[PDB]
Amino acid sequence: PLSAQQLKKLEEHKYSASGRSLVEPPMQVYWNWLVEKVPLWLAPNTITMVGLLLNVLSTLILVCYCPTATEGAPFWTYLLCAIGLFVYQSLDAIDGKQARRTNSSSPLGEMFDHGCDSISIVFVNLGTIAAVRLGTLPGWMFYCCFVGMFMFYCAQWQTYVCGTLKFGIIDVTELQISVTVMFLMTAVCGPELWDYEIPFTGLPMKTIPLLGIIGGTVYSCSNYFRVILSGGVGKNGSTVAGTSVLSPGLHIGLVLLLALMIYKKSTTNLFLQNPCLYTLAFGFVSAKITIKLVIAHMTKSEISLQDTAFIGPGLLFFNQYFNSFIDEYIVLWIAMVISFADLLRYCISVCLQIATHLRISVFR
Amino acid sequence: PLSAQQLKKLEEHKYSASGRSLVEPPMQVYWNWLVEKVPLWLAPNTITMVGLLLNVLSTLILVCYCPTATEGAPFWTYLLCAIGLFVYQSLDAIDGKQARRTNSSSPLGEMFDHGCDSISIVFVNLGTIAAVRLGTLPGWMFYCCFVGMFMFYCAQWQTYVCGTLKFGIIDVTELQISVTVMFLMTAVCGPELWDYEIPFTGLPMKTIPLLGIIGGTVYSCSNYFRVILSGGVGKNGSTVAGTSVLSPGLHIGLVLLLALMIYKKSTTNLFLQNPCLYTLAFGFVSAKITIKLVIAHMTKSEISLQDTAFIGPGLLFFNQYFNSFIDEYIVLWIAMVISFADLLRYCISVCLQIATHLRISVFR
Ligand SMILES: Nc1ccn([C@@H]2O[C@H](COP(=O)(O)OP(=O)(O)O)[C@@H](O)[C@H]2O)c(=O)n1
Ligand SMILES: Nc1ccn([C@@H]2O[C@H](COP(=O)(O)OP(=O)(O)O)[C@@H](O)[C@H]2O)c(=O)n1
Ligand SMILES: [Mg+2]
Ligand SMILES: [Mg+2]
Numbered sequence A, B: 001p002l003s004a005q006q007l008k009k010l011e012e013h014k015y016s017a018s019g020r021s022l023v024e025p026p027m028q029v030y031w032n033w034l035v036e037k038v039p040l041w042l043a044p045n046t047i048t049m050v051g052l053l054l055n056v057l058s059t060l061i062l063v064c065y066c067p068t069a070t071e072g073a074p075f076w077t078y079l080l081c082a083i084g085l086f087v088y089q090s091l092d093a094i095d096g097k098q099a100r101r102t103n104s105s106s107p108l109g110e111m112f113d114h115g116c117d118s119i120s121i122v123f124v125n126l127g128t129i130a131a132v133r134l135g136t137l138p139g140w141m142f143y144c145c146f147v148g149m150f151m152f153y154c155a156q157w158q159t160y161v162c163g164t165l166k167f168g169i170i171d172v173t174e175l176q177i178s179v180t181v182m183f184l185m186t187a188v189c190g191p192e193l194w195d196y197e198i199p200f201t202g203l204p205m206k207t208i209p210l211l212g213i214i215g216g217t218v219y220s221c222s223n224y225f226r227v228i229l230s231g232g233v234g235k236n237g238s239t240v241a242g243t244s245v246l247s248p249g250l251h252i253g254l255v256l257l258l259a260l261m262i263y264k265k266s267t268t269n270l271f272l273q274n275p276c277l278y279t280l281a282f283g284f285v286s287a288k289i290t291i292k293l294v295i296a297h298m299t300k301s302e303i304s305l306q307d308t309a310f311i312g313p314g315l316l317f318f319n320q321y322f323n324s325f326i327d328e329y330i331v332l333w334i335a336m337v338i339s340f341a342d343l344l345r346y347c348i349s350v351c352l353q354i355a356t357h358l359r360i361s362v363f364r
């Protein structure tokens, strides 16, 4: 999975990040106080795995009770989702702090952190789509999920063009806090709160989050794109690996364009009837693509545009080309299963290789 | 177009071929007698260019008077085709002999010979399809043209796996002689000769050539495939370049499979109504692919499966995917023009680079 030269360049890697947000000081104090009361013999990898597992299980439960994201759910699911998200954020901060001390830092930890972040953001966007019941506005339904995916990939990609993480003021902390408080408010008030049309403007309440999200969208994009153009660390304005500046753009554009092309020619309402399956399959594809870029920018190697991850999308596209010989409901399940198995195999193989080389005992 | 190392390996190349056919001695004596009466100041490249030009012009005239390969043509076209084919064979033998003497041999000459052979075999197969009026048997119409293309590519490919050309007993000489005599017989007797159903077996006369061709087909394939499997020249049974044995098979399979896939889902009789345009576009594609393999096996480099020659087939495939927004008659013309321009540009660039390096003055 990893070549000898690339693995050799993996060592002597120094993690670096600069930036601060508005709510950073108080939550920072809280996380510091909580990490003073953590057991000393616990490994950070177990912490991040536990956090990701809790978040995934809770979001999966919420999705299972709300297919198509247009029905209602009890307070049980919303409360569990809020608790899981809060615990995920807390464990992220705590295992970061505990890995920074007691000389347990390793390059595999950052890889685990980034992969967990990808999966968690996909599941969080699914949960916040299902909770608000955004099935009454079919126009704004592709955009939300796939713009969350696109923004995470763009953050990784602008990190590729530079050497240090740059943190803004509207970063993940505020997003997670807002989503948690929104889940709590929906649980306490009921799923019909977003059907409490505001006495003016003739628009429902669901426009209040969405518009803001769009605003944040633009803002985030702005920053990222600047680092794409003005930023340069190598011998020129090119990437740190010496390759072209806009290579990952082709990967993300291919994924999103292929998703849109399959969506627009379904002829049987493939997406508006099975949104969770569609989003999960393409989220696994995008998660593998993002992990590849994470590994690429940890080292100084180069990425290609030929992967054994377009199997599922390829099957969908070639089953759409021929008119119909397999109904477009089992093909989606096959694609999701293939993508999940491929991502799991890739992650397990890379983790095993790194553990064998550095004799880390990943879980210890 | 040619890398420095590959161009350096181009030099110190020795042409080698072994084999003999049944009719080789008499035609060999004739060609020797004719080359004793050739001017000494004429370059072989001009000879092969003249032969290819005559063959192409005559076949183009015959095709223009017989679109769809189901109408009749005057004796003028058939006589011109027979004369052009005979002159092409004669000039091939003569310029080969004249290049072998008077120290004018160069690696560019073999490249010209192979490219001319590719174009000539494509046009000869079109001419023999049009002359026999094989439009009354739509089942056996894809097979003929594309099996001619496939056989030439397979001959080149088995040459790739070894170092020397192997000549059988049913080689190009007998094919050309048979086609010439068939053109002469059709001209003297008329296009209706193939509508003179043989008093027995209840089959028309056009089965007499076709079956034989099929037989020859199998025979040729046999020999080639043996060299594909038993043959080995490098450190192992692999190719002389050290790469995989069955890499060009992917190229030829992609071309033929894509042609068949576009043919089988035309919905408007794209091939059975415009056979000459279809065959010419895919013949230009296959000619460029074959020239690439010729250059590869002249040197010891490696070929890829990513070319700027699938533009035309890509446009056809993606215009078929979307139902129809451009009628499937201008797209074919665009594809043919693009393929022809690409092949001409590639050939001109390679010829200019070789002439600049070796200061040959190609035409002199
Ligand atoms: N399981 C883990 C998680 C993080 N780490 C390391 O600990 C550092 C602290 O990360 P963090 O979570 O505080 O930082 P951010 O989450 O803000 O990116 C990471 O950059 C990794 O190098 C680790 O070694 N093992
Ligand atoms: N225009 C040409 C044609 C052939 N030649 C060379 O002359 C040799 C004789 O080829 P040939 O035509 O007698 O052989 P075949 O046609 O049987 O392959 C070729 O192998 C080339 O090396 C050349 O230098 N310039
Ligand atoms: Mg962390
Ligand atoms: Mg994290």
Ligand SMILES: [Mg+2]
Residues within 6 Å of the ligand: B092, B093, B095, B096, B113
């Ligand atoms: Mg010759």
Ligand SMILES: [Mg+2]
Residues within 6 Å of the ligand: B092, B113, B114, B116, B117
């Ligand atoms: Mg020749």
